[PDB]
Short mmCIF file of C-alpha atoms and ligand atoms in Angstrom, two decimals:
data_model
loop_
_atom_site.label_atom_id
_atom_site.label_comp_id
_atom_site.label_asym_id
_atom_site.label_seq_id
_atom_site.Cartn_x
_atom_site.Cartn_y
_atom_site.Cartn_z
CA UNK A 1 254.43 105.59 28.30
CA UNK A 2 253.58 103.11 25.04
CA UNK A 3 253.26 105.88 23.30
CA UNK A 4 256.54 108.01 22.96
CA UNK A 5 258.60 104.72 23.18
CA UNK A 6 256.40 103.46 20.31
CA UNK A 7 256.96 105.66 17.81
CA UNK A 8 260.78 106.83 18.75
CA UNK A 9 261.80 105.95 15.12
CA UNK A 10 260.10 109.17 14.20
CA UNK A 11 261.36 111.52 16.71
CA UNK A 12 264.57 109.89 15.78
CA UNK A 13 264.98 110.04 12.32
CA UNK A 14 264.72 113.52 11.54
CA UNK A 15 266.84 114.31 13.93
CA UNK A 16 269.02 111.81 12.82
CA UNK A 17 269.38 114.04 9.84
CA UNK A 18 270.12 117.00 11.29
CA UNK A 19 273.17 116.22 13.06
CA UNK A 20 273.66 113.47 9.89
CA UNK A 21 274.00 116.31 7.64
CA UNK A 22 275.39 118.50 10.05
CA UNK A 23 278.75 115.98 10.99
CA UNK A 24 278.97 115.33 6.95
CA UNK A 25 278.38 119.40 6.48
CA UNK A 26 282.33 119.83 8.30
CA UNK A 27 284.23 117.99 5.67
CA UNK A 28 282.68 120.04 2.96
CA UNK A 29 285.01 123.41 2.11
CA UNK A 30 283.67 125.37 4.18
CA UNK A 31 284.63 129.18 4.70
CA UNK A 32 285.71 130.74 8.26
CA UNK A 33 282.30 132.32 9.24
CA UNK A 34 280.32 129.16 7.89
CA UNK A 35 282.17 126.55 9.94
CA UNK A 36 281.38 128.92 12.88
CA UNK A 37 277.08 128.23 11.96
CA UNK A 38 277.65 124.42 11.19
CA UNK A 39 279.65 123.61 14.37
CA UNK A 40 276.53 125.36 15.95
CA UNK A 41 273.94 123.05 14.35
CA UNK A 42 276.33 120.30 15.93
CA UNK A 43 276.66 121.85 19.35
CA UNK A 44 273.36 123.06 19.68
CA UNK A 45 271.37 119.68 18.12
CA UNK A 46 273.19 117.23 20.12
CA UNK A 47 271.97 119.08 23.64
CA UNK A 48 268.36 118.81 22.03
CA UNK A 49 269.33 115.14 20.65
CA UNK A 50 270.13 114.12 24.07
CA UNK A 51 267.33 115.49 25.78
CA UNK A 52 265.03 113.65 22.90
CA UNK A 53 267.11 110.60 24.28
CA UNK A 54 267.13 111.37 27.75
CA UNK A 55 262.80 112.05 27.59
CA UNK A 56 262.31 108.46 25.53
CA UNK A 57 264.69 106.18 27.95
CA UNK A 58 262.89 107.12 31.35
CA UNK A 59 259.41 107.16 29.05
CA UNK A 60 260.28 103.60 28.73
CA UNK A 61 261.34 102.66 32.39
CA UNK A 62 257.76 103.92 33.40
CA UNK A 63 256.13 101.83 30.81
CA UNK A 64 258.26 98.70 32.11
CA UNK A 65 259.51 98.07 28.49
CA UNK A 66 263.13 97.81 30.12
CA UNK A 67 265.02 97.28 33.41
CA UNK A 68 267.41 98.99 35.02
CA UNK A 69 270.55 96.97 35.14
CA UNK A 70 272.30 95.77 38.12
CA UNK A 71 275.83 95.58 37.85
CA UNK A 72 278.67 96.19 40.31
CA UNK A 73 280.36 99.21 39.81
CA UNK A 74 282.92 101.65 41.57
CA UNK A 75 280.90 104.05 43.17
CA UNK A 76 283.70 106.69 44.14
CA UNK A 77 285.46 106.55 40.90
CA UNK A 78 281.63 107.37 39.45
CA UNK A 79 281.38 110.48 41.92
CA UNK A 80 285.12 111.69 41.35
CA UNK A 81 284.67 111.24 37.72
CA UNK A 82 281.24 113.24 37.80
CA UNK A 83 282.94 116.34 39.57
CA UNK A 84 286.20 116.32 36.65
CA UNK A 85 283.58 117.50 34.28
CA UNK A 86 282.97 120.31 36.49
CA UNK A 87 286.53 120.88 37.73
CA UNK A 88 287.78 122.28 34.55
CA UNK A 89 285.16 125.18 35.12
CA UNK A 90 285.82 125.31 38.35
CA UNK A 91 288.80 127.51 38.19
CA UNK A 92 286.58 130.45 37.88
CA UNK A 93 286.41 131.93 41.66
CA UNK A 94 283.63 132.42 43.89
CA UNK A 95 282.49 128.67 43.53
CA UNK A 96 284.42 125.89 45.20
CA UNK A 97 284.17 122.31 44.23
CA UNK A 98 284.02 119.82 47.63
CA UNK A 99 283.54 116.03 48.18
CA UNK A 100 282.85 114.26 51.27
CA UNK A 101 282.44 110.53 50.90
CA UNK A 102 281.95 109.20 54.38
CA UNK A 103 284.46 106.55 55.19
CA UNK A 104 281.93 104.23 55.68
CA UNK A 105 280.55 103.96 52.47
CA UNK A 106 281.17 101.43 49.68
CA UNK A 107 283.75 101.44 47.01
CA UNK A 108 281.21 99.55 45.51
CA UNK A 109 277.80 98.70 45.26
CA UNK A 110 275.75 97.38 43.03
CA UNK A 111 273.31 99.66 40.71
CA UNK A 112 272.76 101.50 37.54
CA UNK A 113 276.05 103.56 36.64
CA UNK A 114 274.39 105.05 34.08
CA UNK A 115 271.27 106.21 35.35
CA UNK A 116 273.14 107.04 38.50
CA UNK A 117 275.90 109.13 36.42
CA UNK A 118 272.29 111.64 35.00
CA UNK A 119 270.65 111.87 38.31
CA UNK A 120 274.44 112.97 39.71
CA UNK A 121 275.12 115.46 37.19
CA UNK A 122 271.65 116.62 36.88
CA UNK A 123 272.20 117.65 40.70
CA UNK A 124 275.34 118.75 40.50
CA UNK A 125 274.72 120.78 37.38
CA UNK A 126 271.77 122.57 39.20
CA UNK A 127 274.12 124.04 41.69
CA UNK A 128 276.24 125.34 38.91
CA UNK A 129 273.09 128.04 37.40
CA UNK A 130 272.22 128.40 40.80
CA UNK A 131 274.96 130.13 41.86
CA UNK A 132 276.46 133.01 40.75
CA UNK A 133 278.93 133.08 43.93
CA UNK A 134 279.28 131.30 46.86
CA UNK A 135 280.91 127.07 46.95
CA UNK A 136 279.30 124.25 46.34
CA UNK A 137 279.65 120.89 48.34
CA UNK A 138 278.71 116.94 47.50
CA UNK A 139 278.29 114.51 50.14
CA UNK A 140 278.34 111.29 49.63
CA UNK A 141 277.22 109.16 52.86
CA UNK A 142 274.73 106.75 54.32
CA UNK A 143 272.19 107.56 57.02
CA UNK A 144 271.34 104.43 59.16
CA UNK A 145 268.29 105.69 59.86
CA UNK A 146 265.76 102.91 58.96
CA UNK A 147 265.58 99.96 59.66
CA UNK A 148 268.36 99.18 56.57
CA UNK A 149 271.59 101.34 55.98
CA UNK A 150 270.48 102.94 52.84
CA UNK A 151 272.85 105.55 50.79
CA UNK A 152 272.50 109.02 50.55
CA UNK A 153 273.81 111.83 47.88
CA UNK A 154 273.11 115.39 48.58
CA UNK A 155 274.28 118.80 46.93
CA UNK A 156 274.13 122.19 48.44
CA UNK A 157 272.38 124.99 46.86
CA UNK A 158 274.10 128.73 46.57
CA UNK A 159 271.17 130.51 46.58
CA UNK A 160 267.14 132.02 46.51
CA UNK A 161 266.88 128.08 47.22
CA UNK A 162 263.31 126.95 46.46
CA UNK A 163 260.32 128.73 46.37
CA UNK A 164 257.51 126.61 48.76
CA UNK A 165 255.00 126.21 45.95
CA UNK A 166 257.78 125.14 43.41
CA UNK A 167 259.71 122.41 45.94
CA UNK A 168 256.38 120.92 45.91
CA UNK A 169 255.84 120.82 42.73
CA UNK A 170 259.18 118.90 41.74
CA UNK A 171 258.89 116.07 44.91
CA UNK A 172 255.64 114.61 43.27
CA UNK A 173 256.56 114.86 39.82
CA UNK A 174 255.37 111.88 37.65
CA UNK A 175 255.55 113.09 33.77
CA UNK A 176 253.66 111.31 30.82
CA UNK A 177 254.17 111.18 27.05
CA UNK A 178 252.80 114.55 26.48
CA UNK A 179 253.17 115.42 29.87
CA UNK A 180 257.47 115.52 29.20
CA UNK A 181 257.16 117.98 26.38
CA UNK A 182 254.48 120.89 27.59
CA UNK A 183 256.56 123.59 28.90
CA UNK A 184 254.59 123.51 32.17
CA UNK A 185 255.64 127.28 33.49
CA UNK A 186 255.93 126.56 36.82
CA UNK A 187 259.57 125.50 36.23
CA UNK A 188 261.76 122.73 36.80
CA UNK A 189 263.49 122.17 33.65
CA UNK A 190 263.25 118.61 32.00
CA UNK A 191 266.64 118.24 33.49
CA UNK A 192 265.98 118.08 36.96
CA UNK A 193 262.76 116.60 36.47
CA UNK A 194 263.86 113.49 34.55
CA UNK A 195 266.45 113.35 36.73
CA UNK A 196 263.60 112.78 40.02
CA UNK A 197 261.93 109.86 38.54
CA UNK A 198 265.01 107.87 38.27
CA UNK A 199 265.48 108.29 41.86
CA UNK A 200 262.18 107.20 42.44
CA UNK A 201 261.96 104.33 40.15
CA UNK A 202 265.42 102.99 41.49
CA UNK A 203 263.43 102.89 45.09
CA UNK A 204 264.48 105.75 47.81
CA UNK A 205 263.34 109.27 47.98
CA UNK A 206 263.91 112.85 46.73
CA UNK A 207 264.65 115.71 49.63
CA UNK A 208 265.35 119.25 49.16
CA UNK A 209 265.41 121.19 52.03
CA UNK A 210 265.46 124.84 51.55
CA UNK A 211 267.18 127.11 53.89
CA UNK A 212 268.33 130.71 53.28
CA UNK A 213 269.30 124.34 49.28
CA UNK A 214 270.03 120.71 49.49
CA UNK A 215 269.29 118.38 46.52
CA UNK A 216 269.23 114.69 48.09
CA UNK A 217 268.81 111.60 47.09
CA UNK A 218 268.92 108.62 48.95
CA UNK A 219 269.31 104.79 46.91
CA UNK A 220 268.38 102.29 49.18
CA UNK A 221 270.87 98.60 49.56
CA UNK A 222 270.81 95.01 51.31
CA UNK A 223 274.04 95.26 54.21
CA UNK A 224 276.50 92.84 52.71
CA UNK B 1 248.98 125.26 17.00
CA UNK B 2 247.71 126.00 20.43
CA UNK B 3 250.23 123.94 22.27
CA UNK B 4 254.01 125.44 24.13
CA UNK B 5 257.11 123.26 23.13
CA UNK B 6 259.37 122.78 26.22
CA UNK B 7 261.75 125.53 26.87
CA UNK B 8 264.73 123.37 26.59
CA UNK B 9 262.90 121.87 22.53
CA UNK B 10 261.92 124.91 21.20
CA UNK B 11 265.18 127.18 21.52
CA UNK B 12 267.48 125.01 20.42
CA UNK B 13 265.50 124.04 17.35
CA UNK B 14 265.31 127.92 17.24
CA UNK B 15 268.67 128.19 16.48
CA UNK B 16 269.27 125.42 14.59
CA UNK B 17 266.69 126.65 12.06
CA UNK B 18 268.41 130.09 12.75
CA UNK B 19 271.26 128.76 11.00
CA UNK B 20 269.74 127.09 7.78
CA UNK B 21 267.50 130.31 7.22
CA UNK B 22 271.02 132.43 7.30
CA UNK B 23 273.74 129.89 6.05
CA UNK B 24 271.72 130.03 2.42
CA UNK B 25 272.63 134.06 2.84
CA UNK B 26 276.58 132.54 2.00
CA UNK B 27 277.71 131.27 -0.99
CA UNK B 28 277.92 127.29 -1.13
CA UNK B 29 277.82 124.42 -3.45
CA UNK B 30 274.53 122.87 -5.35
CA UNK B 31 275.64 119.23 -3.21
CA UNK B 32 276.20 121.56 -0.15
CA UNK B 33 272.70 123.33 -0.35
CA UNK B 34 270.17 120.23 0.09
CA UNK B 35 272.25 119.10 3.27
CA UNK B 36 270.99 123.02 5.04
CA UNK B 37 268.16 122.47 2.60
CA UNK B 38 267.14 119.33 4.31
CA UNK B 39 267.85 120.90 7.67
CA UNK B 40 264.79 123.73 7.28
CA UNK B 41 262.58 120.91 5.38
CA UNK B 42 263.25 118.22 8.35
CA UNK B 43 263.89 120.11 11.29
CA UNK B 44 261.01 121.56 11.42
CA UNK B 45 258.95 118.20 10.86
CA UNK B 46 260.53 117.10 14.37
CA UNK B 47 259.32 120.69 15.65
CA UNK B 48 255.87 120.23 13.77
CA UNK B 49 255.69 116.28 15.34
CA UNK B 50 256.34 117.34 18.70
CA UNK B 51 253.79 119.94 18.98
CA UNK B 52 250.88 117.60 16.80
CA UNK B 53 251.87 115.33 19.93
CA UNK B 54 251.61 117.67 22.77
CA UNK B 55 248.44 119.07 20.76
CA UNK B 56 246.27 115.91 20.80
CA UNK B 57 247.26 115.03 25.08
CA UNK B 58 245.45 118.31 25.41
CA UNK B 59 242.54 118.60 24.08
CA UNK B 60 242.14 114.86 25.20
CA UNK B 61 242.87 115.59 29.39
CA UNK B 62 240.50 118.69 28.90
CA UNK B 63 242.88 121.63 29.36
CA UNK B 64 242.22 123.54 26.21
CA UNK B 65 239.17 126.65 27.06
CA UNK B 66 237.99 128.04 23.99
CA UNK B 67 236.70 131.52 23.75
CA UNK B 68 233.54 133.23 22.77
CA UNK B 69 233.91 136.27 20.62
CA UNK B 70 232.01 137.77 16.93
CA UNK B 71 234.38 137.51 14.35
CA UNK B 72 233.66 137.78 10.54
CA UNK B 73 233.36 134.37 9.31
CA UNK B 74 233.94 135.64 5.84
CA UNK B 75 237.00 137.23 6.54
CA UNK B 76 238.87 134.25 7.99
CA UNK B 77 237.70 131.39 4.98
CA UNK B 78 238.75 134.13 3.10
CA UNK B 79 242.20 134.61 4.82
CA UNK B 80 243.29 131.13 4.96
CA UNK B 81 242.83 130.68 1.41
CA UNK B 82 245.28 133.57 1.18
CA UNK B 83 248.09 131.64 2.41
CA UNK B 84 247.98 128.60 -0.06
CA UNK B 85 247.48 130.67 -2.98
CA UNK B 86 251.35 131.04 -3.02
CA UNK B 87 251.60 127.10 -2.10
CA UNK B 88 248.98 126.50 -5.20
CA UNK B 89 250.53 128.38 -7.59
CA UNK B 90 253.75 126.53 -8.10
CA UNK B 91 251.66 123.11 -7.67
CA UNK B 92 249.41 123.38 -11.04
CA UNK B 93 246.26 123.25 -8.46
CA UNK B 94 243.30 125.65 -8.78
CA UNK B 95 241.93 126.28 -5.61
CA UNK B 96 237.94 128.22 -5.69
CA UNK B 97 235.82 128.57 -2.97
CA UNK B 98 232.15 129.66 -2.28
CA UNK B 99 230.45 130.44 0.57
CA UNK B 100 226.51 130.09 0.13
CA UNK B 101 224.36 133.64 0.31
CA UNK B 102 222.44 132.62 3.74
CA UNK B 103 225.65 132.18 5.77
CA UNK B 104 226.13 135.52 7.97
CA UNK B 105 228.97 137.69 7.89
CA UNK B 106 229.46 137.26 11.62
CA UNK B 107 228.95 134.58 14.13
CA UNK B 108 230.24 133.72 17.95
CA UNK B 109 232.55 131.20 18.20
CA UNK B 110 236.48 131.04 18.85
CA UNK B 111 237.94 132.24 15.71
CA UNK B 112 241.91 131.57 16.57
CA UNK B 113 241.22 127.70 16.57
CA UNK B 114 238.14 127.57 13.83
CA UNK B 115 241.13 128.90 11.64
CA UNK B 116 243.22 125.81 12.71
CA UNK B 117 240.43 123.51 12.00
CA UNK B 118 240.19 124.81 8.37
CA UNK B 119 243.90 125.18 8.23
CA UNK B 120 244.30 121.55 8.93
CA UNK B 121 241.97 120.41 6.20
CA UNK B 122 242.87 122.29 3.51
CA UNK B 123 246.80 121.42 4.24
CA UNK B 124 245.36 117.96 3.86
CA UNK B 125 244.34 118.55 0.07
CA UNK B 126 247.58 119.67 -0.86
CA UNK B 127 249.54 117.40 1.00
CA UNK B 128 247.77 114.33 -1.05
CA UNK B 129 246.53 115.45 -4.32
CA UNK B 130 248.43 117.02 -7.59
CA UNK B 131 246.78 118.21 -10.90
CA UNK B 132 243.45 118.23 -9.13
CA UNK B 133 241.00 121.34 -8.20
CA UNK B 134 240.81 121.68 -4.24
CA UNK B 135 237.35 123.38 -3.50
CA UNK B 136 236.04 124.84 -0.27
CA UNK B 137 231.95 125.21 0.69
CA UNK B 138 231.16 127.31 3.30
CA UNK B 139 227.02 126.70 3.73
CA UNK B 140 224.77 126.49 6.70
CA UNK B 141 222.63 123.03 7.09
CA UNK B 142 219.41 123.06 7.89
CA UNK B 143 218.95 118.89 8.11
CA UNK B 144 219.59 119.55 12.10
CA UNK B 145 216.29 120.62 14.07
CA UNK B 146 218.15 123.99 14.05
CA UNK B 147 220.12 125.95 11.22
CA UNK B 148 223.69 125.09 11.45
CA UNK B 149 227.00 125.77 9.84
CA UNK B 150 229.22 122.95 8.07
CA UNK B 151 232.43 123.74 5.94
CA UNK B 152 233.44 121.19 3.19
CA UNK B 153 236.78 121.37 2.10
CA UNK B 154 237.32 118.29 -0.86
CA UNK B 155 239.78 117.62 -3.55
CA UNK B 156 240.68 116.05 -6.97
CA UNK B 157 242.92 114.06 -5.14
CA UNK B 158 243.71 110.30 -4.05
CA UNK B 159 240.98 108.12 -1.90
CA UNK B 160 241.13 107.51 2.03
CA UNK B 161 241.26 103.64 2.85
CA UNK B 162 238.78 102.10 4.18
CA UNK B 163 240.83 101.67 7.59
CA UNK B 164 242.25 105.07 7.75
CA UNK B 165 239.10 106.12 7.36
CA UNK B 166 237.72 104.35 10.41
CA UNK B 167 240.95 105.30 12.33
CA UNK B 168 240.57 108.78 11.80
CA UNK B 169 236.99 108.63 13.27
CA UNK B 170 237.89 106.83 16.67
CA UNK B 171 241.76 106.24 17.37
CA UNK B 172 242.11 108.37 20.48
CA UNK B 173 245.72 108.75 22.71
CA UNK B 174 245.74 107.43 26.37
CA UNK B 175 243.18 105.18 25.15
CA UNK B 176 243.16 101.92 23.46
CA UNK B 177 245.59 102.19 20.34
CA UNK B 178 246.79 104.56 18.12
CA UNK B 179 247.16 101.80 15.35
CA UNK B 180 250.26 103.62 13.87
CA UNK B 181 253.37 105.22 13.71
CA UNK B 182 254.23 105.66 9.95
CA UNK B 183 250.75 106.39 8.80
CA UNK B 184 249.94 108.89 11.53
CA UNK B 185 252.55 111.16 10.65
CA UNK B 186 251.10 113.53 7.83
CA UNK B 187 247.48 112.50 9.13
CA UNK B 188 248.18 113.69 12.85
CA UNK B 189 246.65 117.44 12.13
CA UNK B 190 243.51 115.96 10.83
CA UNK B 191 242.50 113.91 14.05
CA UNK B 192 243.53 117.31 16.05
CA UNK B 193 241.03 119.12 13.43
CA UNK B 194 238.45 116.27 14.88
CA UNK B 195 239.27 117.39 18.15
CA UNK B 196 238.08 120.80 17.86
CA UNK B 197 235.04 120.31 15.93
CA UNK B 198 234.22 117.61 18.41
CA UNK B 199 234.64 119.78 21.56
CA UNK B 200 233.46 122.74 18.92
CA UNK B 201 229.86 121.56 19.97
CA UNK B 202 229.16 119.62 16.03
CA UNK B 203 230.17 116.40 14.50
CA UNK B 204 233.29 116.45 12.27
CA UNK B 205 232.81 113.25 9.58
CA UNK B 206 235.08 112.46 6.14
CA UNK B 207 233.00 111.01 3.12
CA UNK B 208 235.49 109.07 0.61
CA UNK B 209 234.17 108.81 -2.46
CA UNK B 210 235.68 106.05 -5.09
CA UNK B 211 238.23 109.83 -5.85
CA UNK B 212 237.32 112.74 -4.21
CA UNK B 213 237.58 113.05 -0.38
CA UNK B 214 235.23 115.48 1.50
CA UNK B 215 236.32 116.72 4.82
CA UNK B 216 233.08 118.69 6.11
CA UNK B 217 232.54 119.24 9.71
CA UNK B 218 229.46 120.45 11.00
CA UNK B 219 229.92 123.49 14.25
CA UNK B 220 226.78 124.68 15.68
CA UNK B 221 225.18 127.81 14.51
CA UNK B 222 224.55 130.59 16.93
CA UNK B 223 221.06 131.16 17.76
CA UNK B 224 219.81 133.77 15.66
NI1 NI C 301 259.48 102.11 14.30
NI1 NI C 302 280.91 115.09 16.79
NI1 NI C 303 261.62 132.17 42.61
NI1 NI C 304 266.42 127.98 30.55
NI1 NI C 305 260.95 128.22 7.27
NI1 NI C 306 248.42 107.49 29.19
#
């Protein structure tokens, strides 16, 4: 995990050109169909930029080269603000946008927003090419099961939930350097899978339980 | 390249070099054509990089098979010279080549990666010599208790160091260290090109002489 972290000047700085030409290219004069091409060299190499970034950052949590912070931060404003992203496309019918947050819960605990915010989304945006009709539902509770209330997220799949090889597959998931970048066919795209180690490294497991599914993940926290 | 960019890497790169191959079809400025000019010539060094990456991790962790067919040796020294004529034209170089009298027109081996092998050597002249004569010597070598083959490919061109020399020989990935991240960039295909000849069944070495630089690997011979 050296590796990849080690040399992310050079992953970076071509691509810093890309999108450094690319956000210069707009002020140029540019005609009505090539504005249209540009914008997509913007659109389309920030989604790859970010998944460069998004493979590099979690290379480096499993190398140890940095910590996850812990900071104190609104955990309900984090969960309402994750589904407003998905609200505005939420108009279209046959999905329906719901959030439970247990009254029990925090407000606030204490975490990684950040981290928290992917692993979230990358659930939450599963659902989304999932399903093509149906409503999709986000609980946020705690199970006291165990012998220390720990929290639990969980999302619920629309449909043809999770083949029994590929569930499998995705619960022991640990990705290398080269290992994040293969195109292993078996498919979990690097979305979701980034999104998994977090949730391990952060302590707590991964569930999905696939009935015809439910992406959960449970954080664990000290009862104050 | 024998290695699949992640689904989510390759396509959009795809379209991002989709764009600079058709935006040059539209009329635009001299200062406006090196910023999409830039955009082919370094977005595809970040596509090149990440496959040189994922290339190495496998023929390291074993999972690269290589086949066992007759192809005409001729043929394919022959047919990757093709493709830098055009590339040595423009560059004042005069490539020859001569393959020896003894050497058969067939032999077993894998012919898709034998062609990478070569490719990646003879890139390697280009990339680091000008003005020069790049020369490639196909001939069997009998010094072996057994008649085998070894290609040379050397150049008019600048000396190796004497540490890059010794890196290209040993630096391996999840191993010890890579010893670079600057340096390894346009040398990457040539410890790859190791990696075949190495698995190929024959020793791949580099003499430097104080100018020319020999790349000759030696792959063994089929029996008769
Ligand atoms: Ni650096
Ligand atoms: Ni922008
Ligand atoms: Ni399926
Ligand atoms: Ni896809
Ligand atoms: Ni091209
Ligand atoms: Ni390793």
């Amino acid at each position: 995990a050296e590796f990849l972290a080690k040399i992310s000047h050079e992953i970076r700085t071509p691509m810093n050109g890309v999108l450094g030409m690319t956000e210069l290219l707009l002020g140029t004069p540019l005609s009505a169909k090539q504005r249209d091409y540009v914008q997509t060299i913007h659109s389309a190499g920030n989604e790859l930029l970010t998944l460069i970034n998004e493979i590099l950052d979690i290379s480096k949590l499993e190398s140890g080269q940095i910590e996850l912070d812990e900071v104190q931060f609104d955990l309900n404003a984090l969960i309402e603000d994750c589904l407003d992203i998905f609200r505005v496309k939420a108009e279209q019918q046959r999905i329906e946008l719901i959030s439970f947050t247990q009254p029990q819960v925090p407000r606030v605990i204490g975490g990684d927003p950040t981290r928290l915010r992917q692993v979230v989304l990358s659930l939450l945006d599963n659902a989304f090419k999932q399903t093509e009709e149906g409503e999709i539902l986000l609980v946020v509770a705690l199970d006291d099961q165990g012998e220390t209330p720990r929290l639990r997220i969980a999302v619920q799949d629309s449909g043809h939930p999770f083949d029994a090889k590929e569930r499998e597959a995705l619960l022991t998931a640990e990705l290398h350097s080269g290992d994040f970048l293969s195109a292993s066919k078996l498919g979990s795209h690097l979305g979701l899978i980034i999104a998994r180690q977090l949730v391990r490294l952060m302590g707590g497991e991964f569930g999905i339980q696939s009935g015809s599914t439910t992406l959960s993940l449970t954080l664990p926290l000290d009862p104050q």
